[PDB]
Amino acid sequence: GFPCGESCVYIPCFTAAIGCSCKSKVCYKN
């Protein structure tokens, strides 16, 4: 639910490294 400080329109979340995932063009964790 919280933004990880990275967007993800065409490129995936580098913040997957800290457990974030792309939702609504934004990288989020819970």
Write out the two tokens for 1: 């639910």
Question: Looking up tokens 């964790």, which residue turns up?
Answer: 29
The DSSP 8-state label assigned to residue 13 in this structure reads -
Which helix (H) or strand (E) is 6 found in, with range? strand 2-7
Write out the two tokens for 2: 């919280």
Question: Looking up tokens 């457990």, which residue turns up?
Answer: 19
Identify residue 15 by its one-letter amino acid code.
T
Q: What is the resolution of this structure in A?
A: 1.4
d(CA 29, CA 9): 17
Which experiment gave this structure?
A: X-ray
The answer to whether 26 and 8 are in contact (CB under 8 A) is yes
Which helix (H) or strand (E) is 9 found in, with range? none
d(CA 29, CA 21): 7
d(CA 29, CA 6): 11
d(CA 3, CA 20): 8
